[PDB]
Amino acid sequence: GQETRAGVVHGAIGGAGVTALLALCLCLIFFIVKTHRRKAAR
């Protein structure tokens, strides 16, 4: 869609922020889940 595009196919450069955001969101969810889901250690 963009231009330099090439590999890493579009729907991603305008969306790498989306991906990066998704990674960040996945990190946050993983982090929140990790911080929430208390271990049976108490």
UniProtKB/Swiss-Prot annotation:
- The portions of this protein that span the membrane are 11-33
Superkingdom = Eukaryota
* Tissue specificity as recorded in UniProt: Monocytic/myeloid lineage cells. In the brain, CD33 is mainly expressed on microglial cells.
UniProt PTM comment: Glycosylated.
Give the protein's function: Sialic-acid-binding immunoglobulin-like lectin (Siglec) that plays a role in mediating cell-cell interactions and in maintaining immune cells in a resting state. Preferentially recognizes and binds alpha-2,3- and more avidly alpha-2,6-linked sialic acid-bearing glycans. Upon engagement of ligands such as C1q or syalylated glycoproteins, two immunoreceptor tyrosine-based inhibitory motifs (ITIMs) located in CD33 cytoplasmic tail are phosphorylated by Src-like kinases such as LCK.
Report the family membership. Belongs to the immunoglobulin superfamily. SIGLEC (sialic acid binding Ig-like lectin) family.
Oligomeric form and interacting partners = Homodimer; disulfide-linked. Interacts with PTPN6/SHP-1 and PTPN11/SHP-2 upon phosphorylation. Interacts with C1QA (via C-terminus); this interaction activates CD33 inhibitory motifs.
Question: How are the domains described in the entry?
Answer: Contains 2 copies of a cytoplasmic motif that is referred to as the immunoreceptor tyrosine-based inhibitor motif (ITIM). This motif is involved in modulation of cellular responses. The phosphorylated ITIM motif can bind the SH2 domain of several SH2-containing phosphatases.
Name of this chain's protein: Myeloid cell surface antigen CD33
